[PDB]
Every structure is written in structure tokens, then in C-alpha cells.
Design a protein around this nucleic acid. Structure first.
Lengths: 97, 226, 50, 25, 127, 63
RNA sequence: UGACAUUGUGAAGAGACAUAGAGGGCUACCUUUAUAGUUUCU
RNA sequence: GGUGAAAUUCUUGGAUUUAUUGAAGACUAACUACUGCGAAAGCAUUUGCCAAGGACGUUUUCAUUAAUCAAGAACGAAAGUUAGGGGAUCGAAGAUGAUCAGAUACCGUCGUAGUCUUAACCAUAAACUAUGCCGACUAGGGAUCGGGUGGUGUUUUUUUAAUGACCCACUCGGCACCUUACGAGAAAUCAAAGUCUUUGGGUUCUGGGGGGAGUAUGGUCGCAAGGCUGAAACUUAAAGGAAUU
RNA sequence: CGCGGGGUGGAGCAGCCCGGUAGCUCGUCGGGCUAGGAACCCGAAGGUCGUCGGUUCAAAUCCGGCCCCCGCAACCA
RNA sequence: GACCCUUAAC
């Protein structure tokens, strides 16, 4: 039977959406169907921050971050636990946890 | 893997720091902080003539530690060596670009990204490709989530942007442009021109690429420091 | 299809070159028949960075 | 077996039948 | 005043390049990778080899006259993974702990606007 | 290399294939406020003194 | 392919002649200079 | 370098790595969405040019010119096929390593053919919303894309002398969106899959147990690959759908 | 009816820089894995080396006979 | 990382 009203993707009114390559396995996945997560991370991993700051030549250094839109295929999203299998009722919750 | 290289010599040394001597590299008067660092060259051996081993050299420095202000932290300047005066060499402007984190930080969803590039010629006979980036912004009191532009705002915005970058750089020397890019007055002037199209926050000028320079004209470079 | 008097390729009880048809650049006249100073041979596959 | 490959197997069979019939036609 | 170099850390998977240059970048001093601090290929990518390489890099550069380094960290990028490997933090961490001054950290991983084509095929790495 | 002496301040939890080791947060005996997170093979508890054959390592997990 | 010959000036750490550190499980290839003087890799 | 771990491989002849005038080809990231356009296939850098289009608005015009459609026609992803140009990248075919009983697979490294222009062909995809099109009616509620209407609403050059961008209320059209919901359904579920034994708005196409079998004695199109059309003998008591445990 | 190689456990190879009185793999057997098969792990057995005759420095490798596996030449009137 | 199979015998 039909599992999802959206067919596991976000494509109503298009027909075709260009693929993106998974960042784990390089699988071709439609962009509307990928599991994109945006990674904003401090560049010093938050455990060496004081060591880096105390070794810094500038006071109150801004400590920039890295920005990366990470795209996953469904197989790699499930395996890396980016998403998890959900019950039939609560598959309908679009709101992020 | 220290001892696994199967073959590196089928046949079966001088420390170069001794051979290398530090040279002073300096910024023009268009930037307030003059001394920016030190470079390395091998000795003055007849085959190499270290003076010409120095002339084609570019060092990328932050505008913050080139102007002593954390408000310039997100801009980096490429400075190109031009000639050597006895271990006291002197550079000219070579190119400017944005630091990676700033450009990534300004790009967010639920707004429109408006990029505009121009290849206008500086009156000093310098040819520059100047890139500008702007973002449509939420209006104060706006309830809509996304504040997107309508693709004809974007054409009009790009048009008024490109006219500004063309007019300003065409009619200014290369040094004058660098001294007007520092106070960011180009970004402000674009804000006033596009205010009647879309609110358009974050209107910075990203990379300033130098494409080709005129004849060296040793007097022009010495004009900055004399 | 010639006789050996006429061509380096001539002769034989079958029509065949017999020796490699790639000929050195330093070969002399009368010898330079075939593929002269050929860097390669066979059907050209892929590109040559041209 | 997978219908994709049974379709492929039949197509190879059809190709052989065309060839074996061609040598008589 | 200050004499600055560029730490220029390159943290891939299975290797991390911590290697300091001058301000121009055209003069390298102490190019030490974590591949020559461990015996096994698998054991490279660990932060230990990166810190060992960085420890040797600061030692070889504190003896040259480079007191401070600006940091230019980099993942493989391009078409490949684009995320820094496990040794990137340790290489950066061990540089600062080593008594070497640090300033102006940047992530300079090469990112394409529309890359060429990823490896692995259309079905990807299946394993 | 002169070894260092260290005192635990927090215990994180058991880790490893069979839980045979534990993550602990540890404070240096000299020049405190220098935190470190180490894996301990045997049974450990609060305010226990830890010896480190090397200092500048931090293993956040073990799997 | 090399040498010599028709091959007409200078410069550069001239494998320069006697008294000289190191890197290697006081020890004769490895940037060297203080004492008249024709030659370099090119 | 590469991996689960390796190995194939490159490294005096300097690999990998660092850093401005560099020959190429492809792709258009991030912005990018339960967003837009197109008949679908499909379409994402800038600018110029060229024709086109829906929606809106209209106290403009014609006046039934319409709906759906055998035959017939245009377009039709990818792969593939002739032909000259380009060939960076990746990479059907084609050799190492693990499996060992192999591994001519999955994983490494390479690597030919393969995504531009044609008389160009081919005409197929889970070409999917597995929902033919046109029309009417039947519940709720917000949001969004266009376009209009009303609010001396808020904010904006030379600051409160053309406007724009926001905010509320409507409205037309569109992409959609929250329920085992009146109704429908075998159920899954459904804003149509309702208005259907209280059975009829118009119309096109298709199916009649499973297999043999989309298999031609045939025909037709195609360079070919193949497309379209399409049985019978024979053999079966099931095959199948949606739930439940 | 000429010229050459080769014959070692059931099978395939080690004595061919003249000598470890015979070793290494597959197969077989025993045990262990597993709820039996397989795959895997740990052990064991197996041929006086085709036969006969020659130096007697561990000689049968290298010598001379017969058998067997084969291979090349078997033409020009 | 590797992991093939399973009654004709009521």
C-alpha cells in the first residue's frame, strides 16, 4: 500500500527536481527527498577553546564557526541515525524534535 | 606508516634556515598599519638573485590586523610585492576578499541572495573584477516569515548596484579605491540607491580581483611612501 | 601486395608485413615505409589533451 | 526471477531467434 | 614585535597535514603529517597522530624564529567529503598548547559552486 | 617524560564494548582549571587520583 | 652525436694551489673564507 | 593515496602538501522551500536579443465559435544509434585485494564507450498523483505564490513633495497543507477516491482467475537496439489486494 | 621404429648453484565449532621416489637396460 | 569485516 501521502519526498507541482549526492556514500538522491541538516559548529570543538583563547594574540577573539549543509540519502540518514523509524501515527509530525 | 615505503632510493644535506634570511614586507599608506610581517628568501647566489625571487610574492593579511580594528575582521587583503629596497621592501594593493565564515554566515534561508559582479577599469589603468553581495531583509513589523524578493527587484537591484560600482571605480585611482573601500562607503551608497526597491540588508562588497595592472611605473608605488 | 624486390612489405606465402610496420626516425630511404616514427598505434581511444 | 532480467533474457532469446531465422531467410 | 607564519592544517581522513609556512606561504617550514607518527594506516586519522605531528611542527618552527602562526584549517573538500577529519582539532589544539601564539583562524576548505561529479556512482558506495 | 598526577572531579559513565572502561572528567593537580576527560580501565569513583602516562589527550568516547 | 677549425668583448658561489666546524651504527664528494696570480655549472 | 583492514598505485628523477599573470571541459552549490513556471519530458550564474504564456483587471470586442475525442500529428528523461568538434570529471565493458567453494559481485585503483551540433534517429521509464479530461454542487482552518480592491493603516531620496517595502481585510486564479470525518471505500485511505441498488451531467481509453505470455505463423515503424499490434496449444485452484494476531 | 623430455602419497609439486635416507599443498581421517550439512579451527596418517643392474666418500638422482605419459620430424624427384 | 543451506519419509 501507499506509505506516505507525500511519497517520501517534497515534490507536488514539479515532476523533476535535480539530484544531490549523499555526503556519506555519494548516492544520487533528489534534493527534495534528501535529509539535509545544517551544521553550524564552533571551529575549536569547545574543549580546546580556553587553550586556544589563552594562546591567542588577540583579546576577545570572535572565534568563527563553520557552516555546512549536509545532505543524506535515506539509507545513510537511517544508518547514521539522522532520522529513525517512527510509528505509523507519528510519521505525520513534520515539526522538528 | 614510518617504515613501509617499499622504495624511495634505488641507489643503495644543508639546513636551509641558515641559507634563508628574513626580509621585511610592508603595506602602502592606504592602510594605517605599515609593517605587516616578514618573509624568507635564499641567499644572494648568482643563479637565483634573491631580489627577483621576492618580487612576485603575495601575502594575504586581515584588514583587522592591517587597520587595528576588530570591525574589519571579516575582510582579507592580498598584498603583492613590487620592488625591494634593501630588506625593507614595499607592496601595493593586489586584491581583497571576504573571510570564509562571514560569507557563510550572511547566507541563510528565507531571504534572497543578490550577487553582482563588474569588471570596470580603474583610472590608474588597473582592471578590477569587483563582486558585491546583498540580501533582502525582513521589515520591522513584518509578520511574513520569509521576506523574498520578486526577481524584478533583483534585476533592478543588480542594475543600480553595477552602476554604482562602475561609476565609483571608473574615475578613481587604484589607491583611492582602496582608501574608499576601507570606510565601506560603497556599501552605504548602495543602501541608499536600493532603499526604494527592497530593504536589502548586508550589502557588502566581496572579492576585489585584480585582472591586469599597468606598466610598473616605479614613481607611482613610491608615491604612497613618499 | 608487392614482391620483396619492390617493397619492404612485399613477398610471403600470405600477404603480411612480417616485421613491425613502425619505423624509426633514423631509418634511411627505402626503409621508411609503414608508420614512420610512430609514438603510438592502434585505434585512438579517449582524448590526447588537445 | 526478477522481471527486469526475465525481460532481458527473453530479448536475448528473441535476438537469437531472429539470427537463426535469418540464416534460413 | 611579532613574527608570524601560517599553520595551514589540512585534516583529511587517514591523514592530517599540519605544516607551517611564512606570510606569503611560498616558504614551508616543518611539514609534518600524522602519517609518520604512527605505524598503521588505519591508526593515522586519530587525533593522536595529528597532535604528534603538530608537536614536532612547533618544535621545528620555534627553532626557526616563527613565534606565532595564523591558522588556515582545511578539509579535503572539492567533490570529496568537505568535513574536517578527526585530527583537525588536535593539530590545532597541540599547536596552541606548544607555546606558539595563534591568531585569525579560518576554514579554507575548497567548496565548489556546482562541482564536477562525485565519485561512487549514482547508487553510491554500497556496503 | 615526567608523568603528571590528576584527580577526578566527575564520572561520565561506562563505555566500551562490554562497558569495561569509564569516562571520567579529571582535574590536574598543578595548574588547575585545566580539565581533561580520560578512560579508566578499572573501577573508579569520585575524588580518585589518576595517573596519566601522557597529559594532552581527550577521548570523549570509546566504541 | 662530440671535438677542433671561418668562432670576433666583458660578468657570476672560476670541480680554484697550501694552514679549516657539523649533521655519521678529532675520519680524505655536500652554501664556506683570512695571504700575487690565466678557467666554471652557464 | 586508499580502506572495515589492506593491497593495486605515485614518490633520488621530490610524491603528497604550500603559495597571484595558466590551454581546458563540465556543472551552476550555499540562497533552495510541503516555493515558481511548463502540456508533459522538464526548467536554477549575469546581461543583451527574440518570439511565447497563465493569472489578474476590464461598464473592450466577437458571439456559441464549445467539451471529449477512433484515424491522424507535435513534443517526449535516461540509456542507446548513425556523423564531424570537444573529452575536465565521473564511468556499463575491460586487470589487483577480501571470499575462499568461489566472487569475472558488492570495496581500492585505473580505465574505453558514454550527458555539445546534426538529414539527425530512437519513442521507451515506478514517463507516478500508479488517480483521463470538461462541468456543477457538497464541510471546516490557516498559510503561501501571482494579480487586483479597500484601509490619510507602519516605515522610507533632498529626512515627513513621484513611489517602494511591510500590516490588516477582501477577492480571483494556482502549488499545497490537520484527523479510520457527514459521505465513500475491502481496507489502506480519500478536500475527492463524495453527490454511486435512493444506481443516468458530457465524453475518451482500458480490464474480465493464475500461468503460458506481452511469448508472433503475421503486419508495421526503426540504421540497429527495438517500438506498436498481438495469439493458441497446454497447464492450473487458486494467483492476488488491504487489515488483524 | 629417428630425435627428445618426463615417471616422487589418492592428486599436484619439493633431491636440478650434483647428497638432510623423502618435505609442502589439495584430498582422506579424528576432534572441535553449529540444532545436523557446508565454510572455519586444531591435529593425524599416507609414498624406502616406475622396475632391474652400476662408484661403495649417507648413491638411487648422474650411468646403462625394459615399460608408461607425451612431444617434434616424418621430404624431393 | 565475514555469516551458504535445511523432511520424500504419514
Amino acid at each position: 500500500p501507499k506509505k506516505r501521502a507525500s511519497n517520501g519526498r517534497n515534490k507536488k507541482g514539479r515532476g523533476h527536481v535535480k539530484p544531490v549526492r549523499c555526503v556519506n556514500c555519494s548516492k544520487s538522491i533528489p534534493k527534495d527527498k534528501a535529509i539535509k541538516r545544517m551544521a553550524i559548529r564552533n571551529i575549536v570543538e569547545a574543549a580546546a577553546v580556553r587553550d586556544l583563547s589563552e594562546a591567542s594574540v588577540y583579546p576577545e577573539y570572535a572565534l568563527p564557526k563553520t557552516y555546512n549543509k549536509l545532505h543524506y540519502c535515506v539509507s545513510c540518514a537511517i544508518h547514521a541515525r539522522i532520522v529513525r523509524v517512527r510509528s505509523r501515527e507519528d510519521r505525520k509530525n513534520r515539526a522538528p524534535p | 606508516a614510518v617504515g613501509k615505503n617499499k622504495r624511495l632510493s634505488k641507489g643503495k644535506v644543508v639546513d636551509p634556515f641558515t641559507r634563508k634570511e628574513w626580509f621585511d614586507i610592508k603595506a602602502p599608506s592606504t592602510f594605517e598599519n605599515r609593517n605587516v610581517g616578514k618573509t624568507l628568501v635564499n641567499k644572494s647566489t648568482g643563479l637565483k638573485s634573491a631580489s627577483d625571487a621576492l618580487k612576485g610574492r603575495v601575502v594575504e593579511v586581515c584588514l583587522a590586523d592591517l587597520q587595528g580594528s576588530e570591525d574589519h575582521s571579516f575582510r582579507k587583503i592580498k598584498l603583492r610585492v613590487d620592488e625591494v629596497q634593501g630588506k625593507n621592501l614595499l607592496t601595493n594593493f593586489h586584491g581583497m576578499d571576504f573571510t570564509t565564515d562571514k560569507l557563510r554566515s550572511m547566507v541563510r534561508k528565507w531571504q534572497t541572495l543578490i550577487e553582482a559582479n563588474v569588471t570596470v577599469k580603474t583610472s590608474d589603468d588597473y582592471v578590477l573584477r569587483i563582486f558585491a553581495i546583498a540580501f533582502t531583509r525582513k521589515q520591522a513589523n513584518q509578520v511574513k516569515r520569509h521576506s523574498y524578493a520578486q526577481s524584478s527587484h533583483i534585476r533592478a537591484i543588480r542594475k543600480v548596484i553595477s552602476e554604482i560600482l562602475t561609476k565609483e571605480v571608473q574615475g578613481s585611482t587604484l589607491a583611492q579605491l582602496t582608501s574608499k573601500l576601507i570606510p565601506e562607503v560603497i556599501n552605504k551608497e548602495i543602501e541608499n540607491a536600493t532603499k526604494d526597491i527592497f530593504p536589502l540588508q548586508n550589502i557588502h562588497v566581496r572579492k576585489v580581483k585584480l585582472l591586469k595592472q599597468p606598466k610598473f611605473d616605479v614613481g607611482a608605488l613610491m608615491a604612497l611612501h613618499g | 601486395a608487392m614482391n620483396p624486390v619492390d617493397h619492404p612489405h612485399g613477398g610471403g606465402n600470405h600477404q603480411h608485413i612480417g616485421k613491425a610496420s613502425t619505423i624509426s626516425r633514423g631509418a634511411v630511404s627505402g626503409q621508411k615505409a609503414g608508420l614512420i616514427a610512430a609514438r603510438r598505434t592502434g585505434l585512438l581511444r579517449g582524448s590526447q589533451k588537445t | 526471477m526478477r522481471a527486469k532480467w526475465r525481460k532481458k533474457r527473453t530479448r536475448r532469446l528473441k535476438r537469437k531467434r531472429r539470427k537463426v531465422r535469418a540464416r534460413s531467410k | 614585535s611579532q613574527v608570524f607564519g601560517v599553520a595551514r592544517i589540512y585534516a583529511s581522513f587517514n591523514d592530517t597535514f599540519v605544516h607551517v609556512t611564512d606570510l606569503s606561504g611560498k616558504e614551508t617550514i616543518a611539514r609534518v603529517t600524522g602519517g609518520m607518527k604512527v605505524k598503521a594506516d588505519r591508526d593515522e586519522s586519530s587525533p593522536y597522530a595529528a597532535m604528534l605531528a603538530a608537536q614536532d611542527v612547533a618544535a621545528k618552527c620555534k627553532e626557526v624564529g616563527i613565534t606565532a602562526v595564523h591558522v588556515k584549517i582545511r578539509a579535503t573538500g572539492g567533490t570529496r567529503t568537505k568535513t574536517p577529519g578527526p585530527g583537525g582539532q588536535a593539530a590545532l589544539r597541540a599547536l596552541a598548547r606548544s607555546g606558539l601564539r595563534i591568531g585569525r583562524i579560518e576554514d579554507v576548505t575548497p567548496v565548489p559552486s556546482d562541482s564536477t561529479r562525485k565519485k561512487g556512482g549514482r547508487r553510491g558506495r554500497r556496503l | 617524560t615526567p608523568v603528571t598526577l590528576a584527580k577526578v572531579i566527575k564520572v561520565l559513565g561506562r563505555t566500551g564494548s562490554r562497558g569495561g572502561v569509564t569516562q571520567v572528567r579529571v582535574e590536574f593537580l598543578e595548574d588547575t582549571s585545566r580539565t581533561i576527560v580520560r578512560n579508566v580501565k578499572g573501577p573508579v569513583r569520585e575524588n580518585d587520583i589518576l595517573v596519566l602516562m601522557e597529559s594532552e589527550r581527550e577521548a570523549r568516547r570509546l566504541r
